[PDB]
Symmetry: C4
Subunit: 387 residues, 4 copies
């Protein structure tokens, strides 16, 4: 049957380590897929780690990295959370250089985008077989979440962006049941920018915290009602969570507009806790080095700067990277609310390091009604490799 997922996000005080694949270290001798963007999504039986592969393995000439991101070899695959992205325990999902996946309770729905930048194609899989298609609607790198989509009472939702990485772009919300598209919307957000949204269900609505690659240091936020009606803006909090960014000390939070002249960005997440908010962010304000998560009182609905909790998961002397959100199905947690969990990707090799390749590990963290001590669960690999 279908996963209801109409409950509220559980109010957590800190997060506990779920898993850690240690893919890259293992990849020194094992046959591990040189991967990227290892997001986590769960079914009512297990949580899997999805990732993008370049058809090559670590420590192999084919990992040269000079291969473009959106190459024709890029495929989406997965493994049970915590398992390294190894060739022998991997499952083929879809052909993609940008994807998203979620389980509605019965079958798995993946969405892989592939094809030319000017006319990319997004194929929707369901049950391990393509069911529907979304063609580029603006001829400029059709892309999506890079993290779990959301299914509430059978219908699954996800957000896509078609347009430039700098200036305006066009965003849309797709809705689908059993692999087939049943509706969609255009998101009006002039002056605003949306990319790689980290969504989760909360009170029968799809809450996402995204990335502003145009002019946003604070992250855009968009609550999606089951009828595709929606609400867009930014995380109110008077504290910048995007990377790069300026000091918090110079940031006046804003609920409706981007702030900081910074233009670039990085994929992050955020979890609303009533009116408060758990926001994640690299420790470095410039490099993708370090990962932490702060709880800002009333920060979901106020330019609050009132930090009530802080917990580091990757110290600032270690490489961080992408990070996404997802929820534990109630059928696995046993709680009456949806436990909030996230993952931190850990990029190793180029550009910051001197190796011909580039990949990343990850650690998964979950809700918990306790306060968890700071620590660093970094990659640990030893570069350079045999090459």
């Amino acid at each position: 049957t279908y996963m209801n997922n109409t409950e509220a996000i559980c109010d957590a005080k800190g997060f506990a380590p779920f898993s850690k694949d240690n893919g890259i270290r293992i990849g020194s001798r094992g046959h591990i897929f040189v991967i990227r963007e290892p997001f986590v999504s769960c079914s009512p039986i297990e949580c899997r780690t999805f990732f993008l592969t370049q058809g090559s393995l670590l420590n192999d000439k084919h990992s040269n990295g000079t291969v473009k991101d959106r190459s024709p070899f890029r495929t989406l695959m997965s493994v049970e959370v915590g398992q390294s992205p190894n060739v022998y325990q991997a499952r083929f999902e879809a052909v993609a250089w940008s994807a998203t996946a979620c389980h509605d309770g019965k079958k798995w729905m993946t969405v892989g985008v592939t094809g030319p930048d000017s006319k990319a194609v997004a194929v929707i899989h369901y049950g391990g077989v393509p069911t529907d298609v979304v063609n580029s609607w603006a001829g400029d790198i059709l892309r999506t979440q890079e993290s779990s989509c959301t299914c509430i009472q059978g219908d699954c939702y996800w957000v896509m962006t078609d347009g430039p990485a700098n200036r305006q772009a066009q965003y849309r919300i797709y809705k689908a049941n059993q692999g087939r598209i049943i509706g969609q919307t255009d998101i009006s957000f002039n002056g605003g920018h949306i990319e790689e949204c980290s969504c989760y269900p909360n009170d029968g609505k799809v809450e996402c915290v995204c990335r502003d690659g145009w002019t946003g240091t604070n992250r855009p936020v968009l609550v999606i009602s089951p009828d595709l009606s929606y609400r867009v803006g930014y995380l109110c909090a008077g504290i910048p969570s995007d990377t790069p960014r300026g000091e918090d000390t110079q940031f006046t939070g804003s609920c409706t507009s981007p702030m900081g002249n910074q233009g670039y960005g990085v994929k992050g997440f955020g979890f609303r806790q009533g009116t408060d908010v758990w926001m994640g962010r690299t420790i470095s304000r410039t490099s993708r080095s370090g990962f932490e998560i702060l709880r800002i009182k009333n920060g979901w609905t106020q330019t609050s700067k009132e930090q009530i909790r802080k917990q580091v998961v990757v110290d600032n002397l270690n490489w961080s990277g992408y990070s996404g959100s997802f929820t534990l199905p109630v059928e696995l947690s046993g709680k009456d609310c949806l436990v909030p969990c996230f993952w931190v990707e850990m990029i190793r090799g180029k550009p910051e390091e001197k190796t011909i390749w580039t990949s990343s590990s990850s650690i998964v963290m979950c809700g918990v009604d306790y306060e968890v001590a700071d620590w660093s669960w970094h990659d640990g690999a030893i570069l350079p490799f045999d090459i």
Copy 2:
């Protein structure tokens, strides 16, 4: 229970990428089977990729290739579509240097041919265990489809050829239920030649588009009625789909006879769409380099040359090869018709390249009621290998 498969083929405007194994690239460091003819067949649960192995792995001395095609090491194995043909996720099907497989809805039926050329033997497996046998009936390399067979309401059908590769040969249609042969027919086709048929179910009849290795540039076609009564000939279309071939400009299509003095050939497919037809063909008219698929209006029943659609899946600067047909079970697609899908094998290494070995990758494409942009999902491997 049994898969009905009595529905009509879905009318598609283009095809979307299903999967891509990237076996050869992976095989640079992984333990991938040096394989060939990686056809796809689906059960009411999953689609698997079948392939032939020479008992050797890529980057190993045993891949020397000097080993004959029809050697005693040739075994048929499989993996879930999209997965590389690796040793650790592979399943043993049957001993064969020519095979076919299909799922009737309950168990898997494979057919592997092995043995001496002059007295080869075809063993029918069902449930992962031999049930019946077909001995060479003409003493000249007994062979079969190299792609999915067809099961309609419990009974599965497939076509075999026993005789020379040039001149006439003898062809037959076998029918079987639960692994045991329940009937057969001889196909009268004097002047005509049949090899490696790509079949699919359509309106309770088995439609196949085959290969003419004698004198055919256009491909032979044979509709098989459930009672082994049948119809044979050629794809009508005024456009040559076999390789090698001459220009379309010099080809007068023919519904009943082969045309073009070309004698060799390559395994291809074709899908009837009402009266129209989706035909596949290497882009090069001589080399097995490039892959495309054209929709010819009324081309299934008329010497039509009226092209209504074209979509390249492997540009002409990349190696192509074999290609077959299959259908998505309605139990996976959800549609009320049978979605048409195919696979393109991508040969690397000898003969066109300077390496001691020879193998191939593949990409799977499926129906879809949308128009998909041209692109190239080629192998990508970097030859030569460590050797």
Copy 3:
């Protein structure tokens, strides 16, 4: 539920190739267990290949072979028939340097013998967990079948030998239900010798064809009635099936006594067909090179020399070795009789070859009501290896 297995063996005219692992070739680059005695047994779902491992992999220093047969590293493991004995698809059965296994229809029962030669211990596993034990009863290398045991209507039977390899030894028949021993017998056979029996069910009785390592060129035979009452002797046929052996031309068959002063031997099998008999034997009369199977008219009950069929499975220019018997569960074959199948082990490396290691491949053959052409499905590996 339990597998009845009370039916008669199917009358076959020849055998068809079931599978071939190609382990050793694959083992050149893959991670394949350096193994030995790869017997096959089937459950009402699948047939698996059991084998003995020395805890080492091919192409690794640990394969040095100088390690004794009955070493403490010897463990019994398995894989689905046709799959190589690779580390990643293997299942742990029991600790053993001599074993046997059979499925009663519900769970798997394995029997592994390990320990010191003078006080070896045989542990009976059932459901993947030890249930009972048989201690050496004569203080001289307690050993067993090296091939499938037999289960009829829930109770499983197998034969063991405790004593010297030359002179007399003591033999016994054990019977067990759900992993626990429910009875046993001593086999009186003075002047006779029994080792590595190849058993199969036939008409509610357990028929075995064994090995005479004392003075037998013809093979001992022992029909076991469900009540442990039994019958022992030799294959009547006027043709020697053990290896080494003398010419058939100098062999006067004998139903009750061994013949030929040859003392050594090799594990073989035989299938009764009414009164006839299918006997297997290496082609060489001295080396374990080559494998063939002859059908002798009335040879099961008469000193017959009347050969009605011959089919080679491994030519005489290729290494052979052990060979065992088993039957296809009726739940897999679908027949009303028990299809007779066997396996031929193919030894490579020392002693006949110049490599530091020793292992073997195998091909599985099954019943079939047709006549199958002669051919050779030999190992194919290329020695020596990287070492």
Copy 4:
């Protein structure tokens, strides 16, 4: 449903070999996890071997060992008992540098401790997903069993230690149902020390035999009643079972207090048999070389020195190490009592050997109502490795 486990431990006369992974030997060429503390726990379907990994593989630079025990890469994983801890058949359990696991009959409950020594965190997983948390309660390396926990009628119990390795420390007993903590107790044991307890169910109470790292040569023992009421002390027997230790000849057993000025220790086990007791211990009184198990008459409740049985499982010329206890579910054994089983870890490489790495194999032994001959099932690896 839930596993009752309210039965008494079966009275065994000796133990029989269950399995042996041969991980390290295999690891010479295979992709085996450099592991440690490979304890065994069983579900009502299978017994699995749990182990700790350092995110590295054998024969890889990452196995340098210089990495601290309680590093952030330490994760808990598992495989079906007897299988080596290889990357391709492993399952991710929890992030930990100290763990425990048990199956209540429905789902698996694992407990992994990770984090800083001064504020470590123990995450309880259930169903393959974190459910509850235990924070360090004394700020000094929060740790646990390193062997199977215990579930009786749905509720699972385990013991933890927070405090110094020498002097006093604080111990507690946790109880949990379906992954969530439902109660706990502080163990009063002044002058006494408790670490790495080997527990098992016996007569509806949890019996554990632990380690005294302070001043104990005899092992502490603690019977836990379902209501967290309990009983603590030491194995009465007038024979020392901890390592290092002095001679038995100088040991006056003690039921309530530690004896021998030895301070260090090693993880061992013990099984009560009525009033008797099966105690395990390294053969060497100083090195972790050798493994044996003695049955002391009345030794569970008397300073008895009356040895009734002895059986060596690893001779004294071979490296031994940790050892734990567990029980065969009645649903696997079929008995009316709980069969007692244990595992012996076999440490290879540093410190006793000259290699840059450190790991261990293991052999599993079980109850049995027979007397099993002495023998040595040691690791067998050949050090040093390629490195």
